[PDB]
Every structure is written in structure tokens, then in C-alpha cells.
Ligand binder design. Sequence first.
Ligand code: Q7L
Ligand code: Q7L
Ligand code: CL
Ligand code: CL
Length: 163
Amino acid sequence: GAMAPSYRVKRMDIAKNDEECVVNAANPRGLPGDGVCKAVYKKWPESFKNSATPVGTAKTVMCGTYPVIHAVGPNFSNYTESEGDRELAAAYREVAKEVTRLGVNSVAIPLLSTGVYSGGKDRLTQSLNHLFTAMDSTDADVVIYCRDKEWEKKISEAIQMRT
Ligand SMILES: c1cc(-c2ccc3c(c2)OCO3)n[nH]1
Ligand SMILES: c1cc(-c2ccc3c(c2)OCO3)n[nH]1
Ligand SMILES: [Cl-]
Ligand SMILES: [Cl-]
């Protein structure tokens, strides 16, 4: 575990992370995808061997010895708000199981279902709160990666508010 487990947020490509493993915002079919998923495909293509996994689950595949945790958030275009909320919470619980199993001291994580699976809604708070619900009981240092300047500020505020 980390000596003083923390949350941090950085505004940069998660493919450039400085953590011991990465979470991919994966699609269920293990396809290269878009956004975070395509960045992860470019950096760790070997990790897409048999990475297909259902919505609400995570499946880890090693790129060398570097673990890629493929976490499949729901696409809110297809799910009801209620069912999507349940699957988004479930994906993050499976990420916490994998991070724990791997024994890493740090993990790079995107906000699941906030991009093209958002169904056109701002889900920063919904996705971040499910991240915290899952990761709070882990002792890994968590580094959240985002692209938007305003999201960075809002994620940073939410982290600092609970310290
Ligand atoms: C294509 C674009 C990017 C990207 C991701 C996050 C960023 C960023 C660029 O500039 C500010 O924060 N990664 N692949
Ligand atoms: C649309 C979204 C992105 C993207 C790629 C990598 C990222 C990211 C966003 O947020 C952190 O790591 N590229 N084009
Ligand atoms: Cl997404
Ligand atoms: Cl973002």
C-alpha cells in the first residue's frame, strides 16, 4: 500500500501516467474505441488480447508487466438512468478488486461514462462519487486523469473538500 494513500487529479493524457497500472475506459468488445480507450490502445495495444468483458465489469490484461484494467462503464445512450447508475457503480467496485488483487501502490484512473458514454449529460459528480465509493477502502495512491480545465478544478475541489 501507499504510506498515506491519497487522491490527486491531473489534466493530461492517461497514456503518459506515472502510476503502477492504468484503468482503461473500455468498451465491452475490446475494440480500440475513442477518447481514453483509443489513447490506451495506442500506448498498450498488447493489453487488448481477450480484453472483452461485460458492462459493469473490469478485466485486467498485462502489457509486458504493466497492468491495464479494462473497466466497462455503461453507455447512458442505451441504459436507463437507474440501470446505468447501478452498472457505473459496479464497474468501479470491480476496479477496486483488481487494484487490490494486483498489489499496486498507485493507479491511473479516468472518470468512467463521462465521455461518449455520458448520453450527452455532465456526469462528473456521479462518476467521481462512484469512484470514491469503490476506491476509498483501497490503500493505493489514486491519480485521476481528465482533459477539461473546468473538470480539473471541480475534481480537485471535490478531493480537497474531504481532506
Ligand atoms: C489525444 C488528445 C489527448 C489529450 C488528453 C488530455 C489532455 C490533452 C490531450 O491536453 C490537455 O489534457 N490525448 N490524446
Ligand atoms: C477525446 C478525449 C480524449 C482523451 C484522451 C486521453 C485522456 C483523456 C481524454 O483524459 C485523460 O486521458 N481524446 N479525445
Ligand atoms: Cl466514456
Ligand atoms: Cl475531462
